[PDB]
Design a protein around this nucleic acid. Structure first.
Lengths: 136, 91, 52, 74, 119, 178, 107, 123, 16, 71, 75
RNA sequence: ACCUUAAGAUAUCAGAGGAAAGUCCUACUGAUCAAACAUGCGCUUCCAAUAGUAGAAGGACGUUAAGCAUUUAUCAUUGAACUGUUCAUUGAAGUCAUUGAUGCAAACUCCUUGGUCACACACACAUACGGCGCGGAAGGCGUG
């Protein structure tokens, strides 16, 4: 019995996922389900179950497709994906979040640039990102 | 040796070090030993061809390190001064 | 994927054909394939109200 | 359970073939003596850069760092 | 018997140190550290062209030779005249000694002779 | 025999945790803080200027500058300049230490607040916080405080203005607010 | 005998240390080079960089770095089918010991 | 620049060196400590010849012009295993007389401070 | 006690 | 001389890159003063084929030893 | 518990578990066989050594493999 | 609470003396070497307009600038048309960049650095050029 299969054969998962699927527009059931799926993975690291990571990613993506205006969940999903080790998909998540606001979102731009400073490490590209952000 | 003691003094501050394979690493320096073994924390790695990833910790053998970049403020370290006073160690 | 399939209540209630797919699209909610029958039974009264 | 040092002591005046790590170059000859760093001196050794034998060699001193393995020929 | 001690006895003579890269350093030789860390002063670095058309040359050696900072822009061959290059010990491959010196008076290890007399 | 150069205490030869015990105490943790405060304080206080090469001015250059006017020099007394330098140094320190956190207070009731701004449950640098305050738990849901405006929050702090230009402000506001 | 030879080098005395060095140079793998110097027969040394030198040893050392005279550096540089044989003569030469691979004594 | 013939690595303290590595990269910074011969450089900027312009150094306009990519990196300790050879480029900011003057200054101050420290720590 | 080889001797010798 | 500080990586999955190309992931079991490491249940990351029940790695060819766990 | 690599090689020797030794690259060969004895410096003697390129290699007999080339010793 | 130690040496040969063979020593004596400090060389190189609005050396992690010229942007499975080509589907990885990268070249703006010293506004020179003002920087060589 693996962690992923033990989670997927848990009864609470069915109830939470059914509440989410029955009431897509409440976001209370959405957030409860996301907290449960994240908490059931006690260690978040590079060695945890790939199926469990894919499930967490798909849950976050579905919620962000349902509610496009949640800045904090865009930031949290990007930070979690950063923690998992890869930064290309973190950049993709941040750019998708910026596009969801038509590039005008102060919290997303601030968090994106704060993350960008550590990662890009190229003066011209970083400063061009800053000029693009300041225009919007 | 002075450089090993300087790397020892550089604990707890963000250092950047490049290995002999071509990779680059930067992050908090947790511990270092007399043989240049270092343990970086929250390191942001650059593999030789340019890709950049992230890991929680790393322990790189000192025989592979090319150079280590410590914060610039350590130039004023007390162990870089030549004329020093000693407390006359006891018996 | 495995043991997870995507369903969309809006497209299901609109009596369309592509209410279920394995691709992650906009407006799709994950669900257990073992439990899709109970998902359908949950929307039974609302879909009957729409039909009547 | 023989250790390498007693093994190389026992291989004295035995036909051994030591191969370098570079080009599968193999020297076959009798072992005359050894040092604590496994420096090897071969007498009447024949050189095998490949399966083909190149010739006969008088007496060769082989540096310690190059040998990949020392094996006992029948 | 350590030949570093013999090498320390030259101390003012013209040598031709050929590093492991291929570059050959020519210049007056000052003191030699017990680890063979040579210190040459009036040096003329050069890089032998392999004389073969298709075999080009070492490349890292050209990079190092130019980055030393003394390469003549109009020089046809890769030579860099500079003063006081300090050479790390492990990089030397072979040292061409001058022809004129005597080996019989310099090779006598005084320390080994002292030990032999003492024993 | 190795001694700390900050504590100046001579330490019996160690290499293991004995050096990880000395460097992790308090007499070597804040006494290494006072040292680098002073060294960085100096490089802030340095006032030595570049060497001055004065060239002999020519007649064409002198006549025009002599034509125009003489300029008065403002000068203060010793106590006054002491007080002004103290005030200026204090102002520089206060402004340098200032950090703007309006965005952190603005999103105080966001649905995903505890996962980003708390800074202890973040996913990047949370691994450090994870012997030593009513911390905000990650398990918060949006059902708590369904209506934020029910007297829970307070008005945004008015913008700060420079005190040396405090008479610049308009005398009366446009509208009468009670 | 066996105990002193296998004995770790940090516990023997000074006199037994240079006695061990002399014994290694007389009865050992470097006895070949010692004989080659003493009877003045040429040696053919094969270096690490595909250089073969023919010379007469005048002094060798523990690390196998020797002083040679009448050296005659022989090496080939090739690329594809083409090959060129180049040779160089050096009067007196010092040679570092980390390069040598096999040292052949002339018959 | 001219450097004294009898000048080991100990005399070149605060000289602005030109340290060369095995992989064709040079470092240009002020030497401030050494040991295995692993240096400490103050403001050394690393230079290298890109593979795209390496071909211009090969034997043949009349004067070569090589654009060398350089990175800025400060107070870095090298490792002696990689170092290939060191060259000197520039003299320190201070003249020899001023250097001796500041050494005497610091020696006097240190002796006085040590005497006062002993006088305080005993009584 | 010099290079780690002596320490490894004072482990391997006991191991055998 | 001085044992490397790996007392916190014991029995935790780590991924270390053998030489410059290979990458091996396993459960660390012990270590020596040469930074030799014995790791059980190895798997050569590249599909990826397991190595064996008990492997030892010479500390000369280890470059980095990052850990894929909580640490 | 902690087992040192020397103890692991000792266990290999005692239980005669066959090992496949990875000689490092640019040599491109592997050695398969049983460990009969090891040394300080990871020098190992091998019985019934089998040469395998990187499977049409030739047996070598009993060999002493210098430890400066060994990279892994896996069973 | 953890820690209490690698061992040796401090110029070198030659000569005289003292405690057969070494062995040690000599505010002993020669020669060589090295260091410090004084001190010199017709020693060698370098030290910025004001009679003018300059210039020299080194930078820019500076602008023109999307400059002018080239070149790059996945892999597997399945279906369909097609004479390799196009469209869709599943899975796998995936540094950002394409206003990038690379090649070439030019203008401009700005930073740091220096004796911006004294006497001069001068007809020199084949042995080619009084190196015959005071300092400073850096080396070479010599003496004590």
């Amino acid at each position: 019995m693996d962690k992923y299969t033990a989670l997927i054969h848990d009864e609470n998962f069915s109830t939470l996922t059914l509440n989410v699927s029955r009431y897509p527009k409440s976001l209370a059931y959405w957030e409860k389900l996301l907290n449960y799926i994240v908490k059931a993975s006690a260690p978040i690291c590079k060695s945890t179950e790939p199926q469990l990571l894919k499930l967490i990613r798909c849950t976050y993506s579905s919620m962000l497709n349902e509610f496009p205006y949640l800045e904090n969940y865009y930031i949290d999903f990007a930070l979690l994906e950063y923690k998992l080790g890869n930064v290309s998909m973190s950049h993709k998540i941040f750019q998708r979040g910026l596009q969801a606001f038509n590039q005008r979102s102060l919290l997303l731009w601030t968090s994106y640039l704060k993350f960008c400073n550590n990662v890009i490490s190229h003066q011209k590209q970083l400063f061009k990102k800053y000029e693009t952000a300041e225009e919007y | 040796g002075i450089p090993v003691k300087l790397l020892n003094e550089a604990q707890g501050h963000i250092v950047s070090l490049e290995l002999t394979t071509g990779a680059t690493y930067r992050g908090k320096l947790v511990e270092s030993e007399d043989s240049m073994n270092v343990q970086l924390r929250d390191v942001i790695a650059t593999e030789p061809q340019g890709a950049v990833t992230h890991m929680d910790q790393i322990f790189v053998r000192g025989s592979q390190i090319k150079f280590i970049v410590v914060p610039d403020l350590l130039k004023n370290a007390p162990l870089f001064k030549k004329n020093s006073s000693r407390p006359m160690p006891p018996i | 994927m495995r043991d997870i399939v995507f369903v969309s209540p809006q497209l299901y209630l609109s009596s369309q054909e592509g209410w279920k797919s394995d691709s992650a699209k906009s407006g799709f909610i994950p669900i257990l394939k073992n439990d899709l029958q109970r998902f359908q039974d949950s929307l039974k009264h609302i879909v009957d109200a729409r039909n009547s | 359970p023989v250790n390498p040092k007693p093994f190389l002591k026992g291989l004295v005046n035995h036909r051994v073939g030591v191969k370098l790590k570079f080009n599968s170059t193999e020297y076959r000859g009798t072992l005359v003596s050894t040092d604590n760093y496994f420096n090897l001196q071969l007498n009447e050794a024949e050189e095998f850069v490949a399966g083909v034998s190149h010739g006969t060699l008088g007496e060769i001193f082989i540096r310690c760092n190059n040998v990949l393995y020392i094996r006992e020929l029948p | 018997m350590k030949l570093v001690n013999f090498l320390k006895k030259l101390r003012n003579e013209q040598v031709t140190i050929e590093l492991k890269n291929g570059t050959t350093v020519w210049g007056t030789l000052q003191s030699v550290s017990p680890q063979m860390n040579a210190i040459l002063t009036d040096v003329k670095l050069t890089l032998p062209q392999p004389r073969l058309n298709k075999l080009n040359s070492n490349g890292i050696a050209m990079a190092s030779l130019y980055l030393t900072g003394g390469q003549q822009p109009t020089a046809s061959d890769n030579i860099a005249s500079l003063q006081y290059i300090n050479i790390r010990g492990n990089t030397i491959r072979q040292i061409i000694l001058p022809d004129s010196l005597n080996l019989d008076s310099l090779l006598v290890d005084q320390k080994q002779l002292n030990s032999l007399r003492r024993s | 025999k190795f001694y700390c150069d900050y504590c100046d205490t001579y330490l019996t030869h160690d290499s293991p945790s004995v050096r990880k015990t000395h460097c992790s105490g308090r007499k070597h943790k804040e006494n290494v803080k006072d040292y680098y405060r002073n060294k960085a304080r100096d490089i802030i206080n340095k006032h030595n200027h570049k060497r001055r090469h004065i060239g002999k001015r020519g007649r064409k250059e002198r006549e025009n500058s002599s034509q125009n006017e003489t300029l008065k020099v403002t000068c203060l007394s010793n106590k006054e300049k002491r007080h002004i330098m103290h005030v200026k140094k204090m102002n520089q320190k206060e402004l340098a230490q200032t950090s703007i956190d309006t965005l952190k207070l603005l999103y105080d009731g966001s649905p995903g607040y505890s996962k980003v701004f708390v800074d202890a449950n973040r996913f990047d640098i949370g691994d450090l916080v994870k012997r030593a305050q009513t911390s905000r738990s990650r398990d918060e849901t949006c059902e708590s405080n369904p209506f934020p405006r029910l007297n829970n929050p307070k008005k945004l702090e008015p913008p700060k203005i420079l005190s040396q230009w405090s008479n610049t402000i308009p005398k009366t506001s446009i509208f009468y607010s009670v | 005998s066996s105990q002193i030879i296998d004995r770790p080098k940090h516990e023997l005395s000074r006199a037994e240390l240079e006695e061990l060095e002399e014994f290694e140079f007389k009865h050992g793998p470097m006895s070949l080079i010692n004989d080659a110097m003493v009877t003045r027969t040429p040696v053919i040394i094969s270096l690490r960089n595909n250089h073969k030198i023919i010379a007469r040893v005048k002094a060798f050392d523990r690390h196998c770095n020797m002083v040679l005279e009448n050296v005659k550096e022989l090496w080939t540089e090739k690329k594809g089918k083409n090959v060129i044989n180049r040779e160089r003569f050096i009067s007196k030469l010092f040679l570092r010991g980390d390069s040598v691979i096999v040292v052949l004594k002339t018959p | 620049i001219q450097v004294a013939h009898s000048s080991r690595l100990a005399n070149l303290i605060d000289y602005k060196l030109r340290v060369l590595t095995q992989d064709g990269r040079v470092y240009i910074g002020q030497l401030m400590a050494f040991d295995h011969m692993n240096l400490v450089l103050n403001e050394c900027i690393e230079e290298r010849v890109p593979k795209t312009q390496l071909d211009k150094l090969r034997p043949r306009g009349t004067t070569l012009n090589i654009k060398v990519e350089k990175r800025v990196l400060g107070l870095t300790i090298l490792r002696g295993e990689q170092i290939l050879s060191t060259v000197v480029e520039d003299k320190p900011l201070l003249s020899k007389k001023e250097r001796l003057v500041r050494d005497k200054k610091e020696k006097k101050q240190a002796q006085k401070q040590t005497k006062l420290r002993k006088e305080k720590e005993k009584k | 006690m010099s290079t780690p080889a002596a320490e490894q001797r004072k482990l391997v010798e006991q191991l055998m | 001389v001085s044992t490397p500080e790996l007392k916190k990586y014991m029995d935790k999955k780590i991924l270390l890159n053998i030489n410059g190309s290979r990458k091996v992931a396993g459960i660390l079991r012990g270590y020596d003063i040469f930074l030799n490491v014995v790791l059980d249940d190895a798997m050569e990351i590249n599909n990826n084929h397991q190595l064996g029940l008990q492997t030892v790695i010479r500390g000369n060819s280890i470059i980095s030893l990052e850990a894929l766990d909580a640490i | 518990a902690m087992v040192p690599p020397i103890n692991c090689i000792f266990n290999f020797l005692q239980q005669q578990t066959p090992v496949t030794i990875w000689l490092f690259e640019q040599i491109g060969i592997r050695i398969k066989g049983k460990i009969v004895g090891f040394d300080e410096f990871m020098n190992v003697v091998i019985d019934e050594a089998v040469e395998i390129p990187v499977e049409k290699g030739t047996p070598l007999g009993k060999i002493l493999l210098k430890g400066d080339n060994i990279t892994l010793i896996t069973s």
